[PDB]
Amino acid sequence: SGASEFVRSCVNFETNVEFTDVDAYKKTHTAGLASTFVVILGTHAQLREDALKELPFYCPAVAEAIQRVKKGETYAVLAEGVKNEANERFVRVLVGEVPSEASRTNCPARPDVVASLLSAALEEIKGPETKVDVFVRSTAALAIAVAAARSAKRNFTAKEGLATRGYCDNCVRLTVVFPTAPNPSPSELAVVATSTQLCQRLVDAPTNLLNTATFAEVAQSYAKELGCAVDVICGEELRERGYGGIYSVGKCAVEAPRLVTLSYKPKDETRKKVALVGKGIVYDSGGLSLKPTNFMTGMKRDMGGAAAVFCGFLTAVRLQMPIELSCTLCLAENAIGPDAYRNDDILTLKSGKTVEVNNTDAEGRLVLGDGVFHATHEISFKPDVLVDMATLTGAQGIATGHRHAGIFVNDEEEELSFLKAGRASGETCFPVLYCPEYHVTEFRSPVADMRNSVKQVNNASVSCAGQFVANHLSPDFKGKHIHVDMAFPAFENDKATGFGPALLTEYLRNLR
Amino acid sequence: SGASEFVRSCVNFETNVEFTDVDAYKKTHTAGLASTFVVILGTHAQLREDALKELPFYCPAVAEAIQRVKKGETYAVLAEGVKNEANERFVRVLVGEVPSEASRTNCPARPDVVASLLSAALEEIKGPETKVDVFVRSTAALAIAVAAARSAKRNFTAKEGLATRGYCDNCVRLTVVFPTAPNPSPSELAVVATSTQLCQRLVDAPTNLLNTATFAEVAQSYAKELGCAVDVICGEELRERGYGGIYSVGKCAVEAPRLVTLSYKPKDETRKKVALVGKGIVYDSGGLSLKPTNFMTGMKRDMGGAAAVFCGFLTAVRLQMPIELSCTLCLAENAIGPDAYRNDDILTLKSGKTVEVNNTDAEGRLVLGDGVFHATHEISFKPDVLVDMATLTGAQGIATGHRHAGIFVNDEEEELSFLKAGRASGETCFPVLYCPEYHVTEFRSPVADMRNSVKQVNNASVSCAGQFVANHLSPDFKGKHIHVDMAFPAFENDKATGFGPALLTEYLRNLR
Amino acid sequence: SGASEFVRSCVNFETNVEFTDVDAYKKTHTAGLASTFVVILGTHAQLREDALKELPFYCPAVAEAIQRVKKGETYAVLAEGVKNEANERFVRVLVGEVPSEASRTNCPARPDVVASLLSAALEEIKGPETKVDVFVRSTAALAIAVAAARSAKRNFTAKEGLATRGYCDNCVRLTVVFPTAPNPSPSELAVVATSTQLCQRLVDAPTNLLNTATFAEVAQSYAKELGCAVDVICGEELRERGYGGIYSVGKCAVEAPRLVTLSYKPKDETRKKVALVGKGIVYDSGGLSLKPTNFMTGMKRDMGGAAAVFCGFLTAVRLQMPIELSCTLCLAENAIGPDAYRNDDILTLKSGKTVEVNNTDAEGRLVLGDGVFHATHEISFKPDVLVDMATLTGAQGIATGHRHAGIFVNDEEEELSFLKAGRASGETCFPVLYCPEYHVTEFRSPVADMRNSVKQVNNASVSCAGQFVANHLSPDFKGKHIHVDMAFPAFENDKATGFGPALLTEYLRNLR
Amino acid sequence: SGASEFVRSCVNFETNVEFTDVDAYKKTHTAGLASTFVVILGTHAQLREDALKELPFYCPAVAEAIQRVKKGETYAVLAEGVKNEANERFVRVLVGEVPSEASRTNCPARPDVVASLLSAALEEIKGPETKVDVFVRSTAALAIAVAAARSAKRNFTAKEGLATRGYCDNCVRLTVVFPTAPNPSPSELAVVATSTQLCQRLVDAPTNLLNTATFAEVAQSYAKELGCAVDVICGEELRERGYGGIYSVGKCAVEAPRLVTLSYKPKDETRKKVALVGKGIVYDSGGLSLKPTNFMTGMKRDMGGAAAVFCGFLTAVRLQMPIELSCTLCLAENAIGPDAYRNDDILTLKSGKTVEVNNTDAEGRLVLGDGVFHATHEISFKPDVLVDMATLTGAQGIATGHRHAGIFVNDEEEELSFLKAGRASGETCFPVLYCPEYHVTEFRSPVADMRNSVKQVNNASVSCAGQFVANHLSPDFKGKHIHVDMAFPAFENDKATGFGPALLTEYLRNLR
């Protein structure tokens, strides 16, 4: 009933962020400013432009704020003599200075800071459904929209009885104002913002609300709404049909494991054919290889990859992108108990390859193994590109850091393409070593085709986990393979960031 | 059947210790000494008094023992020419010297040493139901009675087939002889000794004998005997009635969790109204936050708080104290398995506050949370004082040591009062920091009202665990709150001490 | 070279904080406000008082700030139309709301929040020697002065070439304005603030600047300035004169250990006689019991106790308090190397008692042992009270938390008195268990009078370390003994707080 | 004594490998085969070519070996009827099959397998100076030469009295035979092989032979031989001239730290100007941040970076490459003792920036910091490119694995160029994240310009160590910066690989 209230919240989810521009704002709001809380974000150079002097909140207090504000920080004032709909004497104005410096591996618009400046600014807002206008000087529309959405306080929350108000603190109604009409359009940015926030909510929902059944149910309802095909292979049907990876990982849990596959065939021409596969570990105990407490917190987030691909798919269908798409969610709970798969058991994955389990907490790659094979051999079409997303390795952070998802890719060109998409979306990635000839030796088994956990921990371990998944691709698959490890990018300041869908959306938007 | 034999043992439990005085001993036993094993305990000054020279076991051997015995130690002799009922040539006499030094935070009669000297003396006794007379020179009746009771070999034991003789080695029948008629009276000391020993037996019973059902059953039978009301909220009834703390902690176990509440309304005037709440974790695995083996031994003792309050209650009813009393036992097993509450799950306690679990082994405070709210909002009366007892923190030892229970108290005066009661009973306490404004910040949650385990371990962690419990008190409760952490005082030399009931008894006896 | 520049900085240290009141501010600054950056701190009730409306920075913007500001937080505005000396259009005004809630163990004026609000407010100030006025509504002068001083950015720092400008960033000149003439007076608060900041600087100085020689040298120069007697027992003189604790702990280091004793006899006659002893471990490697890296960072702060007592002394002499005072600094570096005292070596302390070392990282209590004996047996007078201060135990935090120094005290009345002094100064304390009879057994040695490290870690270990020190008091000392463990209170947000001197000052000021 | 014998061995070092081709072999050795031990290495396709049938060891036994041999493995036969100089009945022939599969990040000629096949083949050779001919089918001359050199048993060794025969087991004289005249030439490959082996020997020499003095002495003697300028800044001269990083790291050791700089100006004019800087930690104890035993073994290899750049330089000078070159060896021992730099000390590097040490075992970046600044500000010319090489992070392995050195590079084009050079040399690299904006925040200090060890371990830690070094580049340096982390590539099967010099050689050879 808390579950079914959280399901209804996901199924009907709309965003609290709208997009417009300065001139449209001027034509529409002829009754002065339409809010009494205003955030103005730009670089030092952008904030010093004459154009700012004509904006409806500009006044001498705001000009002083611009002169005094330091890089990376906000400077708040009360602006007087700025007419407004509420007829307040004062308007609250925050000015935030964004750094201009950006490395070649980073988004030039620095949405990392935009997000955190906005986030800090919005902590002053309590009341329900308060109008806030964010005037931005960057024209990197997509990156900005993501940053705004993930910062708009639509997070999962069960504080102060909010379980009966959609597990959401509805404190902010946000309007982002670009300098000029944005590309992409306002309504596309809204669909993107909606996906980012839904992903954010799915990731931080506790497992007692989001389990394999409830997640499957969300996908099914969205499937009906969007006019998409959907297929669920549940529980014993997985064992009987040979899906020994995902089945064995999930069979101990109270809610059965499931492979959930959604399909979209566009009405217009198909420019490409793409398969998405996502690690949907709704909770990770570690299994018989039990994690210590300090590593087991935040493991409700082990379904981050499935949320990312689910929300990427949802975006692409709503934007009616000209790409044939499958989306496979690999849903399981990694529980501990008498029927838990063991360290030494030998599983037969759907690939037909045998796996000796030497670590029950290298489970995500088992479910992805079955997912990727399903995507390359069991569905209605042959994808040119396969993207698998997972929040899998604590070594991901060590390798590529908190803000760059590690990517293991079998084609230089598609890798570059995927990196460009991260830089444009602000959901940035960095490559890990692609070198299968070295990685495969880490999984040598004396009794099965392979083990699931590396012999040496100190040997390109993010890459190895990608290689394990690659080992279960259909032998006839000759297409491009992108493996994303997004363990740390999926959360910031101990809250989900909604990372993944906008990355995908940008990558897919630019396929030809 | 071993269970039901242990239940019958608890339900009919009588003590093996009786109390009298020197002059009553002289009038009654006109056939010489009534035993052939005699222990004489006092300080250096007490033992050198002329009065000793008139005692029925005094003789030249005993006088030499007194001259030679060292502080903290016993000195054993065979006394000749001391007539006795058994007509033995010799009488075994042990003389034990108690230190006189006692700090302001300690019981001046030093029952710590009395206990350990007596304990050592009674190791020479094997045979069944052997009469032993302990002549004590201290007049601190209550403290002495406790020390005697906990040292009288009525411990739980399953050695050498003793499962079929009440899980008890019935080797000693003990008579304590004070210098003068004691205050309180012999029969009150017996009731106290009975409570101490029953508590001792409950604590060291293994969980395969004492689980949530069997403990509940003991309470129910005592309820019928004493003419007290009793109420049990069991298993699914806890989930359905919103007791999400205690339910979630216990639901994985084979025996269901239970809230067991006993009530006593005195026949005569009510001087005060007091609620007792006790942590009844019959076994602690740690749950998904599994303890290492060396920390998981002695975790049958995690119900020590429930035993303490149950036995305190039982004493107060049998002494017909003029206080209206409730006693709430928070009974659960913290098991590991598929339906175990998770690190990241969000529980709704009966308080209505949401708790994000970041450590499944900070479970006692969850069950106490529901207990204290039940006691402050769901029962027939409004208590002036609430005492919650738990064996909860390994940090308790670090803070206040092995012999002083840590107390977290919201009122200086009641704290002092409670400390005086510990010093008189010899079940000593010491305060921990009371400072809610600092403790509450340790439980900040990004998704719920609070977490259950501290962010920083190094920040008054015994106090913090007390504060967590305080957070779930009914908002209308304006009364005094005493939180006792008795982890280490509950056992000594790897055996239960029966700590708690006499502390309570003394505190309650002195309320006005 | 950098060392003698840091010595000159300490020797000539003046504070950047001045104190006054509203009416004296009004008579003096008749050109309006004397700064253009203003902080106003008070409680919700204090900030809503009519009196505020007449202060020289009050205006409608500021009134709105007061209505909107949240508890524990600051709210910044630009105030227009406010008379000021610079005649700026705007004055920067920050309003900070202090909580009114304070436990019985806490300072009612909540300087903890005052400090952190001020600290946050002062992060906007970069330029040199910028005038800032802090109007406070609390009349708890002493607490406020400390909070202000420690928050005024006079910290030790070697950033950006500041080694040649006294290791100090001179960015703020601070004026604190009370509602009425403060008690104590402005010039007394300035001396106190000077002491707090000097202590703060000594504690966070690195050991390559503050070693045993340089610290000794500071004390000697201050001694000459203040007209105080001073005595140094250095290196081999310590071994030869029997100071085997402090000598053995320090003898491996490059700079020799030293006992530095300062004396002050007042001009007025006084009955009151007090000895201060401080743990001066300029760096703690752990010795042969080497600390891991994550515990060894911040161990330049192991001289916190010596800084505290040195600065308490300096305050008391500058205020010409009517108390005869000695101050003994126990200076050593705990280094690792061939001549490092060993785990198993047997030392002969000055007390004449032998100590078997079973942990080289329980070193502070060794140097304090020699310090306290020196203070109770080797100096010109017999103190009524001995206070020893040390930053010693990581268990201190576990016991009494980050903000309350643990106190081990042999006299209930003096303990209460010392607690009252912590509450008034805002440098709060809380008692630990005083029970020597239990503590002494933790130091049983089979080959010497005692060990130095507890057998059991989980047995009132802060108390035990206090007891060890007590064991080396002169046998003829019958006076009051206060042992302060200030490990965690000495730092906050990874910067020194200057904790200790004001506590002492307040305790000493109120000796009757 | 053993030291000066190891110095003489390094100074006069000649290789045991010679290079030729099939046709030149045929014209020269007209008495048939010039050895009686023959290794033939190629791929499945290469080994089945008709050309093999005409080689002087071909016979029906060898043909069967080719048909039966498995990939990655060797297959040995005794070949009969093969013309040879010794006129033996049989010639020992080993056929090794190399895989053809190579990823885009790997050397296509797979010298990794060539090396290990050759290595296995050469384990049969014991006798002194035994002639072995290796016929290879790959034309990747440079890669092959390296593989051969590092596999030719010229390793450091002190077994069986070999301390008096140059710490070298002279068991093999090796002749590598390509299909056609190789590019580069035989005599260039010999110089390269000489460098690889010398590097291999320097890396696995124990510190009791190779310390900072002895390494400095080798460099000086080579300097004289080659006609190169050389400069040494030794011990106290480093402190006095402001080199606080390298000085502080090394000052505890018995042999003083040294900055050793060699220069080469070519005879031909050249625009290209390159600086090499190498981490020369001759032994790493960890300092006060002491390593456990299992991490401290192989720490004689912490000078791997200095050996690499020293040997790269030596190659480039002997080949008279048209590049102006400096080579700075940052020589120190990281010892433990009383004058060991501390965790909390604040160092002033030559850059003029202050460093708060929060880990004494992040020492290599301190010495490199002074090295890189010296190279960019204190030498006779302004390099266009700076390459710093170090064996620094155990995280390097986690990130980029055992065979790919991690590279942190400030210019995408130069990175690609450096990667191409690793693929051609077979000393392969892979990029780590370049994103200074994220890395610099990991080194925030409250008392100095920066810390030296990351706050978070799980945040692109190889990259962060690179960034630290970058922070101490001269502010006027606008050139390209390549930071190489070669911790694991420097050793294989617990023996030094000689990694680095050939990578450099190839990169330098191809500068445009």
Numbering used by the authors:
A (entry chain A), B (entry chain A), C (entry chain B), D (entry chain B): 10 to 521
Give the authors' words.
Leucine aminopeptidase (LAP) is found in all kingdoms of life and catalyzes the metal-dependent hydrolysis of the N-terminal amino acid residue of peptide or amino acyl substrates. We report here the X-ray structures of three kinetoplastid acidic LAPs (LAP-As from Trypanosoma brucei, Trypanosoma cruzi, and Leishmania major) which were solved in the metal-free and unliganded forms, as well as in a number of ligand complexes, providing insight into ligand binding, metal ion requirements, and oligomeric state. LAPs of the M17 family of aminopeptidases are bilobal proteins with a highly conserved C-terminal domain harboring the aminopeptidase activity. They form homohexamers of approximately 330 kDa with the active sites facing a central cavity separated from the bulk solvent but accessible through solvent channels.
TcLAP-A crystallized only under citrate-containing conditions, resulting in crystals in space group R32 with one or both metal ions missing from the active site. TcLAP-A crystallized exclusively under citrate-containing conditions, which led to the absence of one or both Mn2+ ions from the active site and hence no electron density for the inhibitors. Apo TcLAP-A and the other LAP-A structures show completely ordered active sites independent of metal or ligand binding. In TcLAP-A, some loop regions in the N-terminal domain (between α2 and β2, β3 and β4, α5 and β5, and α6 and β6) and in the C-terminal domain (between β8 and β9 and between β10 and α11) show conformations slightly different from those in TbLAP-A. The corresponding residue numbers in TcLAP-A are K288, D293, D311, D370, and E372, and those in LmLAP-A are K299, D304, D322, D389, and E391. The analysis of TcLAP-A showed the presence of two well-separated peaks, one with a calculated molecular mass of ~320 kDa and the other with a mass of ~170 kDa, corresponding to the hexamer and trimer, respectively. At all of the concentrations analyzed, the hexamer was the most abundant species, while as the concentration was lowered, the proportion of trimers increased.
